Each structure stands twice: as C-alpha cells, then as structure tokens.
Amino acid sequence: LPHFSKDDYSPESKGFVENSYLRGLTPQEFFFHAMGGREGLIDTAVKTAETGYIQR
Amino acid sequence: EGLVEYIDAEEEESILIAMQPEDLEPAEADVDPAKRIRVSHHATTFTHCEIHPSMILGVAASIIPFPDHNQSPRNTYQSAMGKQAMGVFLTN
Amino acid sequence: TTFRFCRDCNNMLYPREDKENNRLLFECRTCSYVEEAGSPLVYRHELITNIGETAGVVQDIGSDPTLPRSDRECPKCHSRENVFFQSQQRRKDTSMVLFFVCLSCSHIFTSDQKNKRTQ
Amino acid sequence: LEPGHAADQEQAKLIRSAIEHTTLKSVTIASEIYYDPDPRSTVIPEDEEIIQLHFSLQQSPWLLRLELDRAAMNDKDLTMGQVGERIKQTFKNDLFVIWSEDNDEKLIIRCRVVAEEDHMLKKIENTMLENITLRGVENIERVVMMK
Amino acid sequence: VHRNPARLMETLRTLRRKGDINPEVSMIRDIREKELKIFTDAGRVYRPL
Amino acid sequence: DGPTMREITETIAEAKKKVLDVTKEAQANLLTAKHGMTLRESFEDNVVRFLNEARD
Amino acid sequence: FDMGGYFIINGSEKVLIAQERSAGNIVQVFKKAAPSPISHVAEIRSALEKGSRFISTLQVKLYGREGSSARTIKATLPYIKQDIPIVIIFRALGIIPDGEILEHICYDVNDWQMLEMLKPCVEDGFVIQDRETALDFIGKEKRIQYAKDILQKEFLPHITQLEGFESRKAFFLGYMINRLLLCALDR
Amino acid sequence: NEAAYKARYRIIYSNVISKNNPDLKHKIANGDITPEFLATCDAKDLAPAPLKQKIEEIAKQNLYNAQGATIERSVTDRFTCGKCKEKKVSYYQLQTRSADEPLTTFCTCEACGNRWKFS
Numbered sequence: 016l017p018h019f020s021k022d023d024y025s026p027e028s029k030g031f032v033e034n035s036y037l038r039g040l041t042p043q044e045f046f047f048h049a050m051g052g053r054e055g056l057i058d059t060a061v062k063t064a065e066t067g068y069i070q071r
Numbered sequence: 072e073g074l075v076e077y078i079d080a081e082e083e084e085s086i087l088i089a090m091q092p093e094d095l096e097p098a099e100a101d102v103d104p105a106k107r108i109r110v111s112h113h114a115t116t117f118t119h120c121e122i123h124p125s126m127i128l129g130v131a132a133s134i135i136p137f138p139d140h141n142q143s144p145r146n147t148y149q150s151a152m153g154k155q156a157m158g159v160f161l162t163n
Numbered sequence: 164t165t166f167r168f169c170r171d172c173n174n175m176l177y178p179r180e181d182k183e184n185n186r187l188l189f190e191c192r193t194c195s196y197v198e199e200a201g202s203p204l205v206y207r208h209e210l211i212t213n214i215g216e217t218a219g220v221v222q223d224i225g226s227d228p229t230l231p232r233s234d235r236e237c238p239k240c241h242s243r244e245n246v247f248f249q250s251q252q253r254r255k256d257t258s259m260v261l262f263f264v265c266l267s268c269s270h271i272f273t274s275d276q277k278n279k280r281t282q
Numbered sequence: 283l284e285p286g287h288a289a290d291q292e293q294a295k296l297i298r299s300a301i302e303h304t305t306l307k308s309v310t311i312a313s314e315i316y317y318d319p320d321p322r323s324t325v326i327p328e329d330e331e332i333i334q335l336h337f338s339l340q341q342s343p344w345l346l347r348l349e350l351d352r353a354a355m356n357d358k359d360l361t362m363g364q365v366g367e368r369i370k371q372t373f374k375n376d377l378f379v380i381w382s383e384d385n386d387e388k389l390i391i392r393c394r395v396v397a398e399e400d401h402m403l404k405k406i407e408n409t410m411l412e413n414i415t416l417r418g419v420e421n422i423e424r425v426v427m428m429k
Numbered sequence: 430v431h432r433n434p435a436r437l438m439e440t441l442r443t444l445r446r447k448g449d450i451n452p453e454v455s456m457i458r459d460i461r462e463k464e465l466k467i468f469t470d471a472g473r474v475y476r477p478l
Numbered sequence: 479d480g481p482t483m484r485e486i487t488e489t490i491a492e493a494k495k496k497v498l499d500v501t502k503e504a505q506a507n508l509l510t511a512k513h514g515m516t517l518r519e520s521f522e523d524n525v526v527r528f529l530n531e532a533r534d
Numbered sequence: 535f536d537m538g539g540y541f542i543i544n545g546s547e548k549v550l551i552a553q554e555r556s557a558g559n560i561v562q563v564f565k566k567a568a569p570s571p572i573s574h575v576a577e578i579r580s581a582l583e584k585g586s587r588f589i590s591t592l593q594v595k596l597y598g599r600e601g602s603s604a605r606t607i608k609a610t611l612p613y614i615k616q617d618i619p620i621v622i623i624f625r626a627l628g629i630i631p632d633g634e635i636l637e638h639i640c641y642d643v644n645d646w647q648m649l650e651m652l653k654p655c656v657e658d659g660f661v662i663q664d665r666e667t668a669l670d671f672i673g674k675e676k677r678i679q680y681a682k683d684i685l686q687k688e689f690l691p692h693i694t695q696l697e698g699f700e701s702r703k704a705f706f707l708g709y710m711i712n713r714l715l716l717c718a719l720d721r
Numbered sequence: 722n723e724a725a726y727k728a729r730y731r732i733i734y735s736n737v738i739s740k741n742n743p744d745l746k747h748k749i750a751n752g753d754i755t756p757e758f759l760a761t762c763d764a765k766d767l768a769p770a771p772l773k774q775k776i777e778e779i780a781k782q783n784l785y786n787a788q789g790a791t792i793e794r795s796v797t798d799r800f801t802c803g804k805c806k807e808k809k810v811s812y813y814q815l816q817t818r819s820a821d822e823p824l825t826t827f828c829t830c831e832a833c834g835n836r837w838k839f840s
C-alpha cells in the first residue's frame with residue numbers, strides 16, 4: 016500500500032492480520048483481508064459455469 | 072491554499088502516505104491491553120496523509136457498524152441487501 | 164563483440180576474408196569501404212548468464228520518498244543516510260541482497276557475505 | 283527403481299541422468315565463430331595446449347568454438363569424450379572436431395567445415411543445439427528424486 | 430526531454446497547488462527510469478489527501 | 479483471560495523475529511536454497527510457515 | 535433530499551453507468567504463450583482526443599522465442615496485411631543510416647546486450663537502403679503514395695497526423711522497441 | 722578397444738600441458754602404477770591437482786538440485802484423524818459456498834493421509 020516503504024518484506028505488509036476479530040482489523044489489515052476473501056466469491060463464479068456442464 | 076491535493080492511482084505509486092495524522096507523526100520517548108495493535112511510523116518521508124481511512128468504503132459498507140470486526144465476506148453480502156431493504160426513498 | 168559501422172555511408176559491417184594475405188576484413192554492402200579486423204572474435208552466443216545487478220541511480224534517489232532509510236555506514240564517507248532496494252533484475256531466481264546508497268558521496272555498497280562487487 | 287536398488291541414494295541420479303533428456307544446448311555456455319586459418323595454431327591463447335595434443339597422436343578456415351559448463355557436466359554425469367564423440371558421430375566424416383580434457387579449467391570444442399562457409403556454418407550452429415541429444419529420452423525435461 | 434528535473438517537478442507541483450494547473454491533472458516522476466509522466470486524460474479515478 | 483491475551487501478543491511478536499531473523503539472514507545471502515527451489519521461493523515458505531504456526 | 539445526477543426519459547428515471555476501460559495512448563509490453571512464434575509484444579492504443587476518434591492499434595512484436603536463432607523485431611500497421619521489420623519503417627520514416635537508427639533504439643552504447651539483440655534485426659532490412667524503397671515495400675508510383683498517408687494519418691496517429699514530424703514519431707517507435715526488449719532481457 | 726587406447730593415452734598426455742605443471746614435473750618420479758590407473762578413473766581427481774575438491778563438491782550441489790520440494794505444514798493439537806486416530810493434521814480454509822454460510826476448511830491427516838471437509 017502507498018502507506019509502505021518500497022521493498023518491505025515484513026509480515027505486516029505481505030498481508031498478516033494480527034488482531035483478533037474482537038479487537039478489529041486496521042486499514043491495511045482490513046484491505047488485504049478483503050482481497051483475500053473476495054477470492055472464493057470468484058472461483059465460485061467460474062466454477063459454477065463449468066460445474067453444471069460436467070454434472071449433466 | 073495547497074493544503075490538500077487530488078492524487079490518482081498512477082501518481083499514488085510515487086508517494087508515501089500516513090494513516091493517522093496524529094499517531095503516525097510524533098517521536099518515541101503503557102499501551103492499552105484492550106485496543107488493537109497498529110504497527111509503527113518507521114519512516115520520515117510521508118508526502119501525504121489520509122483524511123480518514125473509512126473513506127476506502129462505498130455507500131453500502133459505510134452503513135455497516137464495525138465492518139472491522141467481521142469476516143470480509145459478511146460485509147460483502149450486507150452490501151447487497153441494504154438494497155433489498157425498506158425505508159424512505161425520498162419524502163415526496 | 165562491440166562491432167562497428169563504416170564512415171561516410173554509415174551502415175552495418177559484414178566480414179569477408181583476405182585469401183592471399185590470410186586475414187580478417189569487415190565491410191559495406193552498400194558502399195565500397197573495407198576496414199581491417201579489430202579482433203578474431205566474430206560472434207558470441209551467451210546462453211548461461213550470471214547477473215547480479217544494481218539500478219542506475221539518477222542521483223536524485225534521495226528525493227524519492229518511496230524508499231526506506233538505514234543507519235549503517237558506508238565503507239568510505241561513513242555517513243548515516245542510506246536508501247536501499249533490490250536487484251532491478253526482474254528475475255525469479257534472483258537473490259535477496261541489499262544495495263544501499265550514500266546521500267553524501269553516491270556509493271553503491273552491498274551487505275553481501277560471499278561474493279564481492281565493485282560494479 | 284528396480285527391486286534391490288532402492289535406498290541406494292547415488293543409484294538415483296545414476297538413472298536420473300539416464301532419463302532426463304539432455305541436449306548439447308543444456309551444457310553449452312556459448313558458441314563463437316572465429317577466424318583461425320592455421321589448423322596448427324589458434325589465434326586464441328587459452329586454446330593452445332589443446333591443439334598441440336591432437337596432432338602428435340583439405341579443411342576450412344572458419345572456426346566454431348563451444349565453451350561448456352563444468353557444473354552442468356556432473357549434475358547429469360558426462361565426459362568431454364562422450365559429448366564431442368556424439369557430435370562427431372552426428373555429422374560423421376565431413377566436419378573436423380577436437381576437445382580439451384576433463385582436467386582443463388576451461389572445457390571446449392573446436393571444429394571447422396570441409397563457396398560460402400559462414401552461412402553453412404550456422405545452420406550447423408543450430409543443428410548442433412536443438413537436434414543433438416546426449417543422455418536421456420525425448421520430451422522428458424526435468425526429473426527428480428523423492429523418498 | 431529535460432535535464433535537471435528535480436526543479437521542473439516541484440515547480441509544477443506548486444504550480445498546481447495554487448490553481449494554475451488544474452488540481453485534477455496528474456504528473457509523476459519516475460526517477461529510477463528517468464521519465465516524467467503528466468496526465469490530463471478524462472477518466473482517472475482520484476481521491477484527496 | 480487477560481494474561482492469555484498478552485501471552486498471545488508476545489507469542490505473535492516472538493513469531494515476528496523468528497521471521498525477521500530469516501529476513502536479514504536472507505538479505506545477507508545466508509539462506510540455503512533448499513530443495514524448495516528458488517531462494518526467494520524458499521524464503522516465503524519459511525515465513526508463512528512461521529506465522530501460520532503462530533496463529534493456529 | 536433527492537440528489538439528482540440522473541435523467542428522466544419517457545418518464546422513468548434512467549442512470550448512465552460508469553464504464554471502465556483500458557486507458558489509452560500508452561505503451562505496454564506483454565509476454566506471449568509458449569506455443570507461438572511471437573516472443574514478446576509492446577502495444578499502444580491510439581485514439582485522437584477530439585475528432586472522429588480513430589482506434590487503430592500499434593503492434594511491435596518480437597519473433598523467435600528465447601533461444602532460437604534470428605530473433606527478429608517486426609511490427610504491424612493499420613491497413614497493412616503483413617507485418618514489417620522496425621527497420622524498413624525506420625528508414626521509411628527518413629532514417630536510412632543504421633546505427634543512427636540504433637541511436638533511436640539504444641540510449642547507452644555501454645549496453646551491448648540490447649545492442650547485440652538488434653544485430654539480427656538490421657540484417658533483416660538490409661534489402662533496403664533509402665527512404666524511396668522504404669515506402670515502396672508497403673503495398674509502382676501508386677503504392678509509394680498510399681504508404682505516406684498511412685504513416686501520417688494511421689501510424690501512431692496520436693501525437694499528430696499532420697506531416698513534418700517524422701522525427702518525433704520515430705523516437706517513439708524506438709521508445710517502444712526499447713521498452714519491448716527491456717523485458718526480453720529480464721530487466 | 723581401438724582409439725579407447727587413443728583416448729586414454731592421449732587425453733591424459735595432453736593434460737600435462739595444463740596447470741598441473743608442477744605436478745607434471747614430478748612425472749618423475751611416480752610409479753607406473755599412476756598411469757596404468759589413468760586408463761581407468763579417469764585418473765582426473767588423482768591426476769587433476771586440486772579440483773578433485775571442487776569437482777567432488779560440485780556433485781553435491783547437483784544432488785541438491787535433484788530433490789523435490791517438501792510441503793511443510795503445521796499440525797494442530799485439537800484436530801484428529803479418522804483412521805490413524807492421531808492429532809497431527811493440517812488444514813486450509815477456502816470459500817466454497819456463497820457469502821451466507823462461509824468457510825469450508827479442508828483437513829489432511831499429515832501422517833496417514835485422509836482428507837475431508839467441515840462446512
């Protein structure tokens with residue numbers, strides 16, 4: 016994120032959410048987390064397309 | 072009065088940004104055992120700062136309370152239903 | 164192979180052989196010019212390539228805020244103002260060493276601990 | 283593996299290199315075309331000692347020199363002899379070949395043809411990298427060992 | 430092209446920050462590649478900082 | 479339980495250094511490539527494996 | 535409380551929806567599938583900001599994958615059925631002397647890698663040697679014209695379609711090729 | 722045988738020459754034886770040285786380059802197998818179902834090899 020110094024390989028930047036859902040993510044955490052989840056919601060949009068055909 | 076600028080995606084590449092205007096500025100000369108855990112301010116190059124993070128959201132989410140306390144996908148659904156709910160779409 | 168082009172009709176230079184005198188000659192397939200060989204090396208096809216590089220610092224690499232700072236000390240100037248990065252060789256297998264830079268001299272000093280580089 | 287031959291660690295690579303398709307192109311480090319007209323001395327220093335050996339115990343003046351990788355000659359076992367030996371029985375009687383010894387700090391392979399020599403000495407530049415096999419089976423690129 | 434750009438840059442930036450160059454328009458300095466990217470294009474999403 | 483929170487915090491931090499260590503130990507070219515192919519590829523597989531190990 | 539922003543057509547409140555698309559007039563390089571004669575490519579979508587708005591793409595290819603001999607750099611122009619070696623074009627633009635061409639492609643002579651890369655290329659256009667023929671092999675007398683236009687109104691049409699700017703254009707074609715190779719050379 | 726022888730012888734021778742020488746020377750012386758032885762062886766090594774070392778050492782790097790990556794994974798002490806009834810299993814969650822049910826979580830007995838879902 017532009018809120019980071021170039022070539023930073025530390026965990027808090029490659030996407031590691033340290034807080035518990037109880038404390039609550041941070042801007043960065045929150046954002047990555049997203050990218051992360053939103054994934055399934057996709058291989059489900061395409062899987063669904065071919066799945067059906069096989070099934071039949 | 073040049074105190075804020077309009078930075079796109081491209082011109083965002085070549086800059087640094089502070090999350091909070093405060094916390095991410097002063098010096099380091101204790102910490103709440105309840106709060107979350109934000110990293111640090113290991114840099115003194117900050118070209119710009121974020122007004123408030125919340126603004127990364129869109130209409131939808133903006134309404135969710137504490138979206139920062141739920142599995143990302145939950146908020147993705149809730150932002151597809153507040154559209155199926157009822158209310159006062161105008162007053163006329 | 165640092166090849167060359169002629170004069171006057173400035174193009175490409177193709178080699179030909181001096182039978183009688185047994186020697187190497189370059190030439191112009193457009194004009195007429197002909198010049199003597201520079202070396203017997205006419206071609207090289209490097210397959211395996213050993214590349215460990217640094218990025219050409221435009222010298223203003225102290226103004227670009229996107230980079231991190233370090234408090235180490237150069238081998239000569241001994242300043243404490245750096246700004247590292249990595250091998251701009253966008254190759255997978257590349258290593259993960261750091262190339263710092265002095266803002267008060269312009270010296271490229273690694274943190275390596277096996278090989279030794281002056282380039 | 284075959285019955286017994288199991289935990290025989292080394293026995294492993296011994297076959298790896300007996301399968302994993304290996305091509306000259308995989309072992310080469312360069313290909314160079316030189317102007318050496320004296321088949322009894324190479325305008326190249328580092329090459330001397332070689333030549334001297336192949337004459338104690340017609341052609342063309344156009345040279346083609348191939349330095350090879352040492353490190354790449356063990357991973358998949360191999361010996362200069364073998365290598366060239368193959369190149370030689372590849373074109374046969376119509377292209378002179380030579381080669382340093384497994385002890386030289388620089389392994390190499392010199393050779394000349396035998397009416398446009400350069401042009402034809404490039405068709406044989408490729409025909410030497412992609413249609414030439416050494417040890418292995420075609421199609422099978424990489425191969426590895428597992429416990 | 431343009432030689433010493435360090436100044437060519439902070440001259441445009443403050444030229445913008447006054448309102449002489451539309452605050453919309455974007456200009457980027459890719460130092461490590463020696464390039465000056467300036468845009469006017471219609472369709473660039475942009476926030477405010 | 480209050481302590482089990484701190485006990486976790488540090489259990490996270492400790493897992494950060496166990497990363498940081500492998501960070502410089504790879505910025506100083508002292509990392510065994512590993513059958514894991516690619517030094518970099520071999521770097522991650524260690525970091526990840528270190529943080530996950532921490533969450534669980 | 536209504537915030538407008540919409541329309542009102544044949545009664546109903548209609549909305550015009552944000553249409554995202556691939557930006558324009560920019561150079562991008564792409565790697566291509568293992569099973570193909572083309573190695574890498576640099577693309578630029580050219581569309582005049584105001585006026586008819588022509589959308590002709592400029593393709594700068596790169597035959598010969600990684601390894602095979604004769605890695606030639608060719609490019610495609612609108613209304614031209616075949617492809618063309620960046621050279622012919624370059625001479626077609628009024629830049630006959632190679633090495634000068636290489637001055638349009640290489641900005642540092644201490645970069646023998648890239649230089650080397652073009653050798654095989656110049657060798658390709660060697661069958662030409664003057665701006666006359668250059669425009670010729672872009673189809674006598676009749677075809678030699680057709681090309682002049684295309685390279686004005688259709689070639690890298692952004693920037694300008696006018697006339698007296700063969701220099702600014704070339705420099706770009708180069709800026710492309712440069713970029714193009716910078717990738718074939720893992721940089 | 723033849724030559725063888727031659728070769729052886731030669732070669733050786735050659736060787737021686739070469740260187741060785743011384744040785745050669747021685748031769749011587751021685752024885753023879755040686756040778757023878759050578760033849761055978763071869764021787765060479767033985768033868769060769771002095772190469773022996775290097776040539777012999779070079780083989781090792783090649784052994785190395787022959788082994789197949791080890792998927793390393795954690796084992797949780799509150800997760801159990803259906804056969805090898807042991808608390809050494811790994812997991813990874815994915816979003817199999819729509820945004821109303823969330824997290825499938827697939828298991829793998831890292832020792833006996835059974836896999837399964839939790840919903």
Ligand SMILES: [Zn+2]
Nearest residue numbers: 169172191194
């Ligand atoms: Zn000439």
Ligand SMILES: [Zn+2]
Nearest residue numbers: 237240265268
């Ligand atoms: Zn210094």
Ligand SMILES: [Zn+2]
Nearest residue numbers: 802805830833
């Ligand atoms: Zn199990």
